[PDB]
Symmetry: C3
Subunit: 443 residues, 3 copies
């Protein structure tokens, strides 16, 4: 659609709006199965290759049984990303997998898939899961390999290597991942199977269209949890994202340090808005994502995970127009570190140029077209292809869109360096004012 | 076994105990070899496919020789994770690989594996390494391909593609990993080979049982170091973990911010125990792992790496019962950032609810069963399936175990906001008291 | 060459010099193509396997077309690594891929590769890109599969599975990577193709030699961007690194906390040089890399990316000899956290030993040879194989080189604990002096 951007000279920040939301709010767990064969069996070259591929099948099953001597688990914890909470990503999938170990539970799944490959099963604890038999190695081995150290053809040797290769690759992934994988590969769930799973999935037609048109993103936000091998059934849970928030406005906040440009070294004070990240309207509040690198962007669609978010009042948006607004305490950090750098935005580039640093913006066909002076400045991607700050070359995003340079005095000029609080990583406008008042009292 | 949990209302923290240790304390280096063939050789379709697979073999060897023009190296450095030291993970493996470049050293290995595939070799510097020949491409090429632009069969074309595929995949992994890979794949070392390596390994019967029952974890903590190609031998060092600490008590500390709940904005002070992470008794002290996500958990067994640990006095455990104890200076951080979030624990969930945030705990079959008020609170996973804080849904771990809610006044109530030190990421109880005393002196 | 190291007892730091630079300063974008076939077509076992592999070809094309419904994008942001700027890594490649969607542009590439596989094409916006047709599936399908539900041979079934496997694997990588991959695999660009691309690349003979001898590093610093499928052409952009800075001196700075060793707990003050990382002379300044783990090291050659760098005055090197020099304000952090740890350097080990921690250096053949006392100390890798601090065992790098122990009084002794500022993560020598002067004024 229409991506736009506004740069705020007063606070050394830029906001890119025009994006639409696609937020991971929940999980849907499906049970993928592979029906196994339980077999016990002079020789020629064609049969020797079959027995070789057959031992790869036996060892793969043995390896997966050895891998599941314990509850499946992943690694769990105990700018503002350090403010986020701590979830357990696969807790819902592990719970479903715990149910499959109850006796008779696997038999319910084995029975529902006897006449078809797609089925919805209600488990003993009342959870409605979608079940899927993607490979019937039982039917192949018992009907195309059991008739054989007897006669054989090589068209069978090849077809068995093709059909067994999926189980071998699924085992490889689970082996180097301790039974939990993300993203979900095409061996765990092919593109045809995933699209079929999304269509038979119980969701809105909006969610189906969104997931089908972005299967690569659905893969990156899914988990494959190796579950159980019991009664000739190989089952692993695939945990798929639910997008409960769709098509709400999103905007990306880019920030860079704002410093004074005095010549005498050590006299300079700096200030940086710390609330950078993705923002999306969500249920009367704003879902704020401090680590924007956790969100995936596809054109104007933004895919984030609410586990990596804070829920803030919508008044946080006021910090972009008036950082001194009386309704929200805008978060900033203070420092005396005036180092030069640049932040590439959606439609331009913020340049924090200080000291003796050479800062330019160039075009590919003409070279330098603008030389930045000391301070925090901005250039749009129209006519500009590269930005240089020191020895670092930045390419700018060449996506179409309009920028707006909002002129304003840098707020760092309003502060007396003698009473400026420094080394505050987690501060705000009011906290700095409160500390300056305490220092001015002692003077 | 028996996992239990205690929540401390006074300090907004929870401790999960009942776990057993499995700590990576050292390394064992083994030398895996692949015996190569040194060959120089109208045509039909079956031979054409053999010559195609033969050039894949030549290019794989050429590619691995080009990759080892230099010493193998990985990337090295120069809540409390920033306190950890800096190791060189593959320093022991690289040292062993440096020895294999000394002349006559590879010949010692080539000779020991002439009659068998398992052998222990004493190297020139006196290191006892386990040597393993996993693929003899020399024997296959010289006996099944050298007899051939002559007659041929397709059962050979297939068997050569199968046997050569391992060298092709080992080359692929080393190519996109600069010769150092982790975890160690099934191409580097199959499950049968790894288990065989662990059994012939010189360790306790306890370590063998532990490694064999958790090969997937052993893979994730191992490195494969591409070493040398000399005299028809392809050697790469596999660096396997040593678990010198086993079956000692472990417990996981979860912490969340504790803030005052005053209505006037900006008047609230916060406090967070920063010593969260995994703790395991280890040789009279406690091995503390500040980034719990570096540890892998299998049922009640906890796999950590001592490189990611601090060695602390056992009195650090006193911070869970009495954070004001006179024997250990409990680490905390101070802030005025009262944002809402939740921390999912082993057997429940800590909820830090502040401001206007909607915080609930729900059951799948009935919906909301508890609404949290402002402050830091806790709920156990019995009867609870989800926790919601703002727009973020958390699933709780559904593992069996008993929780205990230890009531106590939040220690944040004991502090005067007028003299409260703020923005201290690396503080402690005594440091805060020392700073408050200095502020009270000036008043 | 000659790697050397100096340890500074005064500031608990060590500098390793003797390295040569190889800095990623720019990007070169090439367009890799795969010519596709557009086909629409009782049966036997050999043909059935062909139709099975043919549907894998159709589904792979359909999957890649479904993947490119949107602009390709990656994840972007919005000790001193938090000072770095924010780039858009694939902005140059995405720009080139945007040009290929203009009409007639793909036809220009399709035409230039009709008679050869290597070609340089000038695009409509005037960018000179290197074009490469690596797979002609059109020529194979239209000439070896179109003659066929008729007669067939199995030597064709095998050759088709071999030739189609590359497209299947390229699709797999793009599927689990949202169309952007790094490092660039051997399926995206084989070793023969990459070396050929580097030779036909327009660069210095120095850059060609450097890239050819370190293709594994070039792979790790490259991106493969899935671009377009139009008019029987499968095109993806490969973004290759440009090394504009080569063979300048580099040195690695290792730092560890320096604390007082008083016996009464809580009275100790600590100080840590925060400017650790890689340093390379670059165009009159110094390119400083605060997160040394982002640089890859091959023997004495150091591969870094200027996007992960700050451009500093060369006087920053003065902090190693005289941390109180009047020309550069050396960056330090202050704390009261006196925890023990070690930092493994290039040629030795720094040991910060405090409290009751057992700190030793050992040899493999004799055990402990040195016991560290409280403070910050150092040992070289000559005669030393392991260092132990608490329950953590460190192996030291066994590379050849000379160390120099520069004796000096620890600067932490020069500070009065009563007026020592604490919890300053982003401080400097002058900022600490400025704060001590303010505290001494109030006293
Ligand atoms: C605190 O500081 C602000 C601005 O610096 C000022 O407007 C306000 O009056 C001060 N309050 C007190 C109590 O000093
Ligand atoms: C320091 O503060 C603590 C508690 O705030 C108090 O018990 C102690 O007496 C104080 N010491 C001094 C020297 O002020
Ligand atoms: C600041 O401190 C330094 C050293 O602590 C001293 O040399 C200098 O004179 C002080 N300056 C002032 C204005 O107090």
């Amino acid at each position: 659609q229409n991506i736009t951007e506004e740069f705020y000279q007063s606070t050394c920040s830029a906001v890119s709006k025009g994006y639409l939301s696609a937020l991971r709010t929940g999980w849907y767990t499906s049970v993928i199965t592979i029906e196994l064969s339980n077999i016990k069996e002079g020789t020629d070259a064609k049969v020797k290759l079959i027995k070789q591929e057959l031992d790869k099948y036996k060892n793969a099953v043995t390896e997966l049984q050895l891998l599941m001597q314990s509850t499946p688990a992943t690694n769990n914890r105990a700018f503002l990303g350090f403010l986020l909470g701590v979830g357990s990503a696969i807790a819902s999938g592990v719970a479903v997998c715990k149910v499959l170990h109850l006796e008779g539970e696997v038999n319910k799944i084995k029975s529902a898939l006897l006449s078809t490959n797609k089925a919805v099963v209600s488990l003993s604890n009342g959870v409605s899961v979608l079940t899927f038999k993607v490979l019937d190695l039982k039917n192949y081995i018992d009907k195309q390999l059991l008739p054989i150290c007897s006669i054989s053809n090589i068209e069978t040797v090849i077809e068995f290597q093709q059909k067994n290769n999926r189980l071998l690759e699924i085992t490889r992934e689970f082996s180097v991942n301790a039974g939990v994988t993300t993203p979900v590969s095409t061996y765990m769930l092919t593109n045809s199977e995933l699209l079929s799973l999304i269509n038979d999935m119980p969701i809105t037609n909006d969610q189906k269209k969104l997931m089908s048109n972005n299967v690569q993103i659905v893969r990156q936000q899914s988990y494959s949890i190796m579950c159980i091998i019991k009664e000739e059934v190989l089952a692993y849970v695939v945990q798929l994202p639910l997008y409960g928030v769709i098509d709400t406005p999103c905007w990306k906040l880019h920030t860079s340090p704002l410093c004074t440009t005095n010549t005498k070294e050590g006299s300079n004070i700096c200030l940086t808005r710390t609330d950078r990240g993705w923002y999306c309207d969500n249920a009367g509040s704003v879902s704020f994502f401090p680590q924007a690198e956790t969100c995936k962007v596809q054109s104007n669609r933004v895919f984030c995970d609410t586990m990596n978010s804070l829920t803030l009042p919508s008044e946080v948006n006021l910090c972009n127009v008036d950082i001194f607004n009386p309704k929200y305490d805008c978060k900033i950090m203070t420092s005396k570190t005036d180092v030069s750098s640049s932040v590439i935005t959606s439609l331009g580039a913020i340049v924090s140029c200080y000291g003796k640093t050479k800062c330019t913006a160039s075009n590919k066909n003409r070279g330098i077209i603008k030389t930045f002076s000391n301070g925090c400045d901005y250039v749009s991607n129209k006519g500009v292809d590269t930005v240089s700050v020191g020895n670092t070359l930045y390419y700018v995003n060449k996506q179409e869109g309009k920028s707006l340079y909002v002129k304003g005095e840098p707020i760092i000029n309003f502060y007396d360096p003698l009473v400026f609080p420094s080394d505050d990583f987690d501060a705000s406008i009011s906290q700095v004012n409160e500390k300056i008042n305490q220092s001015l009292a002692f003077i």
